[PDB]
Amino acid sequence: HLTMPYVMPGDGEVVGVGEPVAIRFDENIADRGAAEKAIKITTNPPVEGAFYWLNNREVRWRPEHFWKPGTAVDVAVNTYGVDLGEGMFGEDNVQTHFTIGDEVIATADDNTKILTVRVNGEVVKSMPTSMGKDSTPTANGIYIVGSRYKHIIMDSSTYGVPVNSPNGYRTDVDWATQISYSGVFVHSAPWSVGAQGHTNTSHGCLNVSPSNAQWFYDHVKRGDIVEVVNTVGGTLPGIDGLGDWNIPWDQWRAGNAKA
Numbered sequence: 001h002l003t004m005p006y007v008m009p010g011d012g013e014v015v016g017v018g019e020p021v022a023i024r025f026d027e028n029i030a031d032r033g034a035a036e037k038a039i040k041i042t043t044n045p046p047v048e049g050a051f052y053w054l055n056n057r058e059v060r061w062r063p064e065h066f067w068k069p070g071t072a073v074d075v076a077v078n079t080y081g082v083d084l085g086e087g088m089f090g091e092d093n094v095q096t097h098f099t100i101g102d103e104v105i106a107t108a109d110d111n112t113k114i115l116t117v118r119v120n121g122e123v124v125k126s127m128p129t130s131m132g133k134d135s136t137p138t139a140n141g142i143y144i145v146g147s148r149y150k151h152i153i154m155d156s157s158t159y160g161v162p163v164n165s166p167n168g169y170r171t172d173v174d175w176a177t178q179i180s181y182s183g184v185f186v187h188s189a190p191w192s193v194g195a196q197g198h199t200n201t202s203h204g205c206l207n208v209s210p211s212n213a214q215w216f217y218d219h220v221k222r223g224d225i226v227e228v229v230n231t232v233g234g235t236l237p238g239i240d241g242l243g244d245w246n247i248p249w250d251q252w253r254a255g256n257a258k259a
């Protein structure tokens with residue numbers, strides 16, 4: 001009947017302007033309100049933020065707008081002995097201190113088929129891309145950068161689609177940067193370098209050149225932003241895991257502490 005929290009990002013990390021604070025618990029939290037009250041977030045410079053739950057075990061906190069570069073963030077999860085409902089008690093306190101690095105925002109525009117990277121306002125890179133083909137389009141929205149992989153075997157069964165079923169796949173991929181928990185990545189796509197900038201051919205990922213994918217791997221960090229615009233797809237869910245910013249501030253602020 002004890003639940004331990006885990007906070008992200010990790011102590012000492014430098015993260016991009018889209019990185020929310022994340023407190024994950026190893027058990028469903030009955031009393032979200034108690035959990036929220038136990039978590040103190042301090043920022044310098046000070047900015048307003050708010051909690052919103054992505055599922056029964058993980059709550060997120062972020063501001064209305066992307067963080068200002070340079071901001072220092074302190075999180076104290078003071079859950080030791082707190083009654084979190086249905087007879088579950090916080091097993092422990094946890095903490096983290098982190099800082100916000102440079103503003104890196106990349107936009108993938110399906111009308112141009114170009115992924116442009118802006119660092120602190122200025123364009124530093126302009127990569128042709130090939131996104132989701134019309135029958136499996138890439139969703140528009142704001143994506144937060146997660147993990148990066150030098151090499152990875154991309155397998156659709158990970159995400160509930162059998163490899164040998166119509167939209168299935170299993171492929172070795174290089175220089176992959178994760179941007180949704182649903183399995184969207186910016187990655188090396190040596191096969192479609194002729195289609196990149198012209199035609200969408202993917203299952204939903206952002207195909208770029210091997211060298212552009214390596215650059216993206218090397219120069220993006222956790223919490224940087226990728227925005228996809230003008231596709232024929234839907235909208236990344238706000239509760240994806242990396243889709244937090246697609247929930248409008250009015251709704252995020254109001255929260256969901258009583259659900």
Ligand SMILES: *SC1C=CC(OC)C=C1
Nearest residue numbers: 154169171184185203205
């Ligand atoms: S992210 C991704 C998904 C499928 C691929 O090719 C089968 C490549 C990348």
